[PDB]
Design a protein around this motif. Structure first.
Motif, short mmCIF file in Angstrom:
data_model
loop_
_atom_site.label_atom_id
_atom_site.label_comp_id
_atom_site.label_asym_id
_atom_site.label_seq_id
_atom_site.Cartn_x
_atom_site.Cartn_y
_atom_site.Cartn_z
N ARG A 153 27.69 72.24 37.27
CA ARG A 153 28.74 71.78 36.36
C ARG A 153 28.85 72.63 35.10
N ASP A 154 27.89 73.53 34.85
CA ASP A 154 27.90 74.36 33.65
C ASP A 154 28.04 75.82 34.04
N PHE A 155 28.95 76.52 33.37
CA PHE A 155 29.24 77.93 33.62
C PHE A 155 28.73 78.75 32.44
N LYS A 156 27.46 79.14 32.50
CA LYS A 156 26.84 79.98 31.48
C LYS A 156 27.16 81.45 31.77
N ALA A 157 26.44 82.36 31.10
CA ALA A 157 26.60 83.79 31.31
C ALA A 157 25.25 84.40 31.66
N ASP A 158 25.22 85.18 32.74
CA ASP A 158 24.03 85.92 33.15
C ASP A 158 24.44 87.33 33.53
N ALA A 159 23.50 88.27 33.40
CA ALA A 159 23.82 89.69 33.60
C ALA A 159 24.22 89.97 35.05
N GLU A 160 23.41 89.50 36.00
CA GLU A 160 23.77 89.64 37.41
C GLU A 160 25.02 88.84 37.74
N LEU A 161 25.17 87.66 37.12
CA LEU A 161 26.38 86.87 37.31
C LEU A 161 27.59 87.58 36.73
N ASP A 162 27.43 88.26 35.59
CA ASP A 162 28.54 89.03 35.03
C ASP A 162 28.89 90.23 35.91
N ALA A 163 27.89 90.87 36.52
CA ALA A 163 28.17 91.96 37.44
C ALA A 163 28.93 91.47 38.67
N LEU A 164 28.52 90.33 39.22
CA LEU A 164 29.23 89.74 40.36
C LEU A 164 30.65 89.34 39.97
N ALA A 165 30.82 88.79 38.76
CA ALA A 165 32.14 88.43 38.28
C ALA A 165 33.02 89.66 38.10
N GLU A 166 32.44 90.76 37.61
CA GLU A 166 33.20 92.00 37.47
C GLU A 166 33.64 92.53 38.83
N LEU A 167 32.75 92.46 39.83
CA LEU A 167 33.12 92.89 41.17
C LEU A 167 34.24 92.03 41.75
N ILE A 168 34.14 90.71 41.57
CA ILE A 168 35.16 89.80 42.11
C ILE A 168 36.49 90.01 41.39
N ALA A 169 36.46 90.21 40.07
CA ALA A 169 37.69 90.45 39.32
C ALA A 169 38.32 91.79 39.70
N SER A 170 37.50 92.81 39.96
CA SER A 170 38.03 94.09 40.42
C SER A 170 38.64 93.96 41.81
N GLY A 171 38.05 93.11 42.66
CA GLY A 171 38.66 92.85 43.95
C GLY A 171 39.98 92.11 43.84
N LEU A 172 40.06 91.15 42.91
CA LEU A 172 41.30 90.41 42.72
C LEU A 172 42.39 91.29 42.13
N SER A 173 42.03 92.21 41.23
CA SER A 173 43.00 93.09 40.60
C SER A 173 43.29 94.34 41.42
N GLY A 174 42.55 94.59 42.50
CA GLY A 174 42.73 95.78 43.29
C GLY A 174 43.92 95.70 44.22
#
Lengths: 335, 427, 306, 76, 335
Positions: A180-201
């Motif tokens: 239920r909580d969406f914090k920030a983590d370094a590996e999580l931020d890397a995964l989020a960057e990959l997913i966002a790059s896939g969505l914007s690609g």
């Protein structure tokens, strides 16, 4: 006048595959490519009447007579083997590009205005929050559902596949990351960057998600149940049917997608539930109640119409909700 | 021919309708019977019929099977018969056509009133033409007859502008030169009703079930029947089929789809013939498809030679089907473990194991790869031919005559093709 | 309608939930129109950029599996469904039955153009593969084969071989590649021949009855079964016109306002599933579009087969 | 319900029923005199015709086996 | 007015597994991991006429004619080996926690009121008596249903599995701990406290329960039994089918759960019968009767409705019964 499109549709971005279920022993999760599959079996259950009575079946004689008739059923059951305590759930996920592009749409001015709205959203903040929440839903074992409930330890391993090999690998502790909580983590931020790059690609980004849950030695696992209509046949049928692809218990793809979509924490009602699956009219099947009612100005259709036609840009959270609905897809448009 | 008799028939039918609604309602109070008899016995009932017709429509291709929240234009159209061969559709439907009804589910009484056959045929063709027998039995005045005629004839025409809803299907079709058309298809309810009638006659008809009972007792009968396996049921209304159409109310859903399935739609498993000596008679021999093929070959081995050319042709593609299934069976054993042929065992068919497991050459670079490359085993074809000789009927009449010569020639052709298939397996 | 200069073998494509509702009267394998439309979408997305043309598709169906169940006491079958989201008032929506199935197919794409000489064959084959890896084939996603034992590479072979022997060997090796499967072809001529035979058997027989007879299991008294030459499935053969061709702006609620819209209805034809070794050339299995917009007849078929 | 008699055969139902799935059921057993041939658990909503059709195949194969077992010997 | 919810589904706490039964020798049960599994075999029986006649065919001629033609049938039978005298039955139990929370609840106010009721129960009387009775039902081999009636000596070994290793081990003489009394024992109180911690959600509890019983050399054992709909002649008159997982005789998980639930000693009738399984309307299938009739105000539904809606808290024993029903789970709620 910018009339809304009569036919509107969006392709399903971020589409997963069927979650194949297999079994093995903990501390052997690395050599789990040859783990035997979990098979759906058959067993007989004899229960007794335990539902509410309608004030006419409450007579003791009728109740005893109805109990004296045995209640027999045949159910599909999936179990871990009696020497394996770890359930391995593996599926593939494609993060498609062209996220804001509608699949079908009538009005060309509506095309330009909607694409302009998505362009404003992406160059304002982009998919940073949405891909963060999707990477969180991947990092915690929300796609296991009832398999995540009583597990001693859950570990999720996510691999990026570029050509045929692991370009980048992740490993998460699902029980440490909250549901239920969406914090920030370094590996999580890397995964989020990959997913966002896939969505914007313009193509797609492929991820395989493998989750190991230490359920217990020989315990009972929960694949997705199949929806079969009885259709008033006279013969008695099996009450419970489990889903399997090739003699191997599996979870439905839309079940996994609903698990990944559970990012909506911006609905007008209180977050006692926490996140909910992103849907038009904010429907929750488990709660039987649809939040984001159209009587309030927070449903997807009214928010989108105010955003693109009258240029009434909603709050940033509601913009995230609208773009998450665009990720989800759907058949829209009035007659 | 006479308007008086048509008036007599329509008055009779509204009389059974009146007594039926009085009996079903059983009105003992609230003055319901007086209102029913004052509104369903005269030309006022024709006025209500003209009112109700505007809400209904006769169609042959409806849209409501596609997502029931879709509001589109339903059509009553018969497509032209194409000149291209070998294809079915609605254009075969001629006099054996049943018209669908779309609209309210309570106004369908005017449909059965309009589909009457009073003097020998339907009222539709009577009201289309300027018939003296019609157009006067329903109205004393000419203007009332004209307005009722236009109302009752417009029920077969398209109402409103042509529209297909968003939930309906629209499929681009590429034109031959740089173009597309949108091709929104409608559900052919007339075709599915006709096929439903045919399938219901074939599966539950009296003659059909009599033929099934004749086969159950293994006795003769003047005609046979059909079986129709692997039928699928697609229901349209979950609980209210009448909300779709009247034809969908006659058959409550039940699309009765036909099984367009590939042969590998029931793939069972793959197994290794470990402790057996010859796979073609021991593990290959009891797969259901090849069992059916060898039983058909058994039946065709002892047959008359009046149509001997066609019979030999049929047996040629028969043995072709056995060899094709053998090739498929080896191809699906190719997905097993690479080194199952190296397992211990007294009987493991080492002669055929070179062909059964090509993938052993990868792990065995010098043990068996060069042997398989240089030997090029084609005696597997000879062993399968010996198995087929064991699987053919032992008829001495064929052996003495040239029938066995033709059978051996076609077998030699199929086995040399099969051997050429196994020849270039090292590429 | 044309001879391809090369054959593009898309490898084993795992299709997740394909539309098992092929036609209003048939179920099971998806319609060939889906495959032809997918190939045309491949040409529209990547074929133009490669200066090539992608026309013609060969369907082999290495594996099939439909989400179906057989209720107890019935011999027919029903389709497993999905639980759709609830309505805005919290009640269960009306169920619209759709059939969803698992496929595993490999496609032979007919390639002709100048990009074959302009680009290496492996490069265009690859780029078509990762173009198709983010698409849909019959309403279902495509599984892109990650972290298995070894992926199947795409292979484009030019039909203009150096010799007849080389061409024949290349055809046989390509056939060996897609071996655990059955090629799908159309049998319009066979359907017409059977319809004429049925008409000589008894008159006023339509081609619908001939199509039904070629697929049903017939029992004849002395109790034998009328044998069939092949598998002989009934397939949708295209679309026939049901309304005059409207202008792009006439039809309300169209997909777009730049394309004319004509209401159609399904055409049902005969098809056959057969092993790929029983075809002379692998380009004879290719399915093509045949529109002919003047009389309707928006058809897909595989010509030049026999 | 009541026992169904088909020539020498008898389909007698069980005295007490059961529930398979959520529907009531009874076991119907087929006899040939004293020889029990088959037992089937059938829904209570079946009529006599459906119960008879459930055992029609077993009766037919009994008839076929009786015709082949006691066929008269043939002179040529 | 706070009416009860239409959908009030509850998930099952105390999840058992299928109990696989093996065979060996007493005083060799310490090293019993390699014991061969009990196999289900087929044997032929010939039954005589031993049932009540219907007063029509009691004449001697028809009875003698029926006796002259007995019925032949095949039954699945499970026995110990002739050189093995003891039976080892092994399963794993998982205590979940979170009993008051429903899995599905369409009424939010009812869910909040029910959660408040369960919370004030836990604050007043936690899962101490319920866990004690579950510990009794684990300590005595009540999950050995017919394998316990004539056993010379029964021993139950329960191991708490933490991180795949035995964190704490128990050993009980299951014949000393009777099936009738819920007494006090220090080791059994420790087991009860562990089950309490599992039920309260304060920790993950996974128990591995192994039972050894001396029945005799070659004696018949009693696994779970499957239902047979059609007998026919194609099957060799298969009259009884026993439950097995992979060529190994087993007991159904729901039978084990029923044996654990036999804690209800608070039903309005006399406890001369003893404890019964916790079910709505207190039904016993063998007795053919329902204790806790709905006509009396002691069934689960009326007690729950009075406790939650009208705030009428029942007696502490009835509160224990209601919370045991919530632990058991169900499809509670009307239409």
């Amino acid at each position: 006048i910018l009339s809304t499109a009569s036919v509107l549709a969006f392709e399903r971005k971020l589409d997963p595959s069927d979650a194949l279920m297999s079994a093995g022993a903990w501390a052997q999760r690395d050599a789990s490519q040859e783990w035997p599959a979990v098979t759906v079996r058959e067993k007989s259950v004899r229960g007794t009447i335990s539902n509410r009575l309608k004030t006419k079946d409450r007579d003791p004689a009728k109740l005893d007579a109805s109990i004296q008739s045995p209640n027999l059923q045949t159910v599909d059951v999936a179990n871990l083997p009696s020497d394996a305590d770890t359930l391995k759930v593996r599926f593939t996920l494609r993060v498609l590009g062209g996220a804001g592009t509608p699949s079908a749409c009538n009005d060309a001015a509506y095309r330009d205005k909607l694409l302009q709205t998505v362009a404003t959203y992406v160059n304002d903040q982009g998919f940073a929050e949405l891909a963060r929440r999707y990477a969180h839903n991947l990092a915690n074992a929300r796609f296991l559902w009832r398999n995540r409930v009583g597990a001693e330890a859950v570990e999720v391993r996510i691999n990026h596949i570029r050509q045929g090999e692991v370009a980048r690998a992740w490993r998460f502790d699902a029980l440490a990351i909250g549901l239920r909580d969406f914090k920030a983590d370094a590996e999580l931020d890397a995964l989020a960057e990959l997913i966002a790059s896939g969505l914007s690609g313009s193509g797609h980004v492929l991820l395989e998600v493998v989750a190991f849950a230490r359920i217990g030695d020989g315990q009972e696992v929960f694949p997705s149940q199949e929806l079969i209509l009885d259709k008033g046949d006279k013969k008695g049928q099996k009450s419970k049917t489990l889903y399997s692809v090739r003699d191997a218990a599996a979870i439905h793809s839309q079940k996994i997608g609903n698990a990944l979509r559970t990012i909506d924490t911006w609905y007008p009602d209180e977050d006692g539930l926490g996140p909910i699956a992103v849907e038009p009219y904010g429907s929750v099947t488990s709660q039987g109640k649809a939040y984001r009612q159209p009587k309030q100005k927070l449903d997807f259709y009214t928010l989108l119409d105010n955003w693109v036609l009258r240029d009434e840009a909603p709050a940033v959270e509601q913009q995230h909700y609208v773009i998450a609905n665009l990720i989800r897809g759907g058949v829209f448009g009035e007659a | 021919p006479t308007w008086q008799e048509l008036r007599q028939f329509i008055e009779s039918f509204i009389q059974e309708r009146l007594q039926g609604k009085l009996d079903k309602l059983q009105p003992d109070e609230d003055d319901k019977r007086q209102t029913l008899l004052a509104t369903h016995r005269r030309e006022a009932w024709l006025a209500d019929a003209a009112r109700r017709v505007g809400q209904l429509q006769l169609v042959t291709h409806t849209l409501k099977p596609i997502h029931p929240d879709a509001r589109g234009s339903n059509l009553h159209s018969l497509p032209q018969a194409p000149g291209q061969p070998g294809l079915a559709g609605s254009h075969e439907l001629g006099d054996r056509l049943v018209s669908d009804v779309v609209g309210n589910a309570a106004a369908l009484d005017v449909f059965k009133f309009l589909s009457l056959q009073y003097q020998g045929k339907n009222l539709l063709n009577w009201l289309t033409e300027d018939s003296a027998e019609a157009l006067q039995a329903l109205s004393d005045n000419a203007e009332q007859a004209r307005e009722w005629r236009q109302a009752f004839i417009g029920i077969t025409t398209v109402k409103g502008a042509p529209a297909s809803h968003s939930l309906a299907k629209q499929l681009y079709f590429p034109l031959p030169g740089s173009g597309y058309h949108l091709l929104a298809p409608l559900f052919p309810t007339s075709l599915v009703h006709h096929v439903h009638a045919l399938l219901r006659e074939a599966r539950f008809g009296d003659a059909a079930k009599a033929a099934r009972e004749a086969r159950s007792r293994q006795e003769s009968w003047p005609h046979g029947f059909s079986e129709y396996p692997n039928l699928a049921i697609q229901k349209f209304g979950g609980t209210k089929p009448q909300n779709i159409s009247q034809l969908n109310n006659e058959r409550r859903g039940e699309n009765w789809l036909l099984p367009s399935l590939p042969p590998n739609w029931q793939r069972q498993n793959v197994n290794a013939p470990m402790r057996h000596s010859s796979v073609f008679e021991h593990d290959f021999g009891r797969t259901p498809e090849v069992s059916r093929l060898t039983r058909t070959l058994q039946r065709f081995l002892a047959k008359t030679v009046h149509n001997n050319l066609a019979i030999r042709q049929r047996r040629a593609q028969l043995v072709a089907q056995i060899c094709d299934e053998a090739l498929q069976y080896a191809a699906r054993l190719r997905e097993l473990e690479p080194g199952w042929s190296a397992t211990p065992g007294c009987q493991l068919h080492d002669a055929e194991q070179l062909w059964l497991d090509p993938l052993r050459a990868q792990t065995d670079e010098t043990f068996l790869q060069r042997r398989l490359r240089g030997d090029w085993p084609a005696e597997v074809g000879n062993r399968f031919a010996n198995w087929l000789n064991r699987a053919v009927s032992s008829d001495s009449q064929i052996l003495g005559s040239p029938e066995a010569a033709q059978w051996s020639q076609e077998l030699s052709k199929e086995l040399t093709m099969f051997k050429e298939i196994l020849e270039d397996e090292r590429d | 309608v044309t001879d391809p200069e090369a054959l593009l073998l898309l490898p084993r494509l795992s299709i997740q939930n394909a539309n098992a509702i092929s036609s209003p009267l048939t179920w099971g394998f998806p319609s060939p129109g889906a495959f032809t439309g997918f190939v045309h979408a491949l040409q529209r997305r990547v074929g133009i950029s490669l200066d090539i043309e992608l026309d013609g598709v060969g369907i082999v169906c290495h594996r099939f599996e439909a989400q179906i169940s057989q209720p107890a006491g019935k011999r027919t079958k029903v389709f497993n469904l999905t639980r759709n989201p609830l309505n805005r008032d919290g009640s269960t929506a009306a169920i619209v039955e759709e059939g969803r199935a698992h496929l595993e197919v490999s496609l032979l794409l007919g390639v002709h153009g100048d990009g074959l000489d302009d680009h290496p064959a492996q490069e265009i084959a690859r780029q078509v593969q990762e173009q198709a890896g983010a698409m849909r084939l019959a309403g279902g996603s495509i599984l892109p084969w990650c972290n298995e034992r070894f992926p199947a590479p795409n292979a484009e072979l030019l039909m203009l071989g150096g010799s007849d022997e080389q061409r024949r060997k290349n055809q046989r090796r390509l056939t060996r590649r897609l071996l655990p499967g059955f090629a799908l072809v159309s049998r319009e001529a066979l359907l017409q021949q059977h319809l004429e035979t049925l008409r000589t058997t008894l008159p006023e027989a339509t081609t619908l009855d001939a199509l039904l007879d070629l697929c049903r299991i017939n029992f004849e008294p002395p109790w034998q079964v009328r044998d069939k030459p092949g598998w002989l499935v009934p397939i949708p053969a295209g679309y026939n016109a049901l309304s005059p061709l409207y202008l792009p702006g006439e039809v309300r609620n169209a997909r777009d306002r730049e394309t004319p819209l004509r209401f159609v209805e399904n055409l049902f034809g005969l098809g056959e599933w057969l092993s790929p070794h029983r075809v002379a050339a692998l380009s004879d299995l290719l399915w093509y579009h045949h529109a002919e917009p003047d009389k309707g007849l928006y058809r897909w078929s595989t010509p030049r087969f026999v | 319900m009541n026992a169904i008699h088909i020539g020498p055969f008898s389909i007698t139902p069980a005295a007490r029923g059961l529930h398979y799935g959520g529907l009531p059921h009874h076991q119907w057993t087929l006899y040939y005199g004293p020889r029990e041939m088959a037992i089937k658990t059938l829904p209570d909503s079946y009529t006599s015709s459906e119960v008879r059709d459930e055992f029609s195949d077993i009766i037919a194969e009994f008839v076929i086996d009786a015709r082949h077992r006691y066929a008269p010997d043939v002179l040529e």
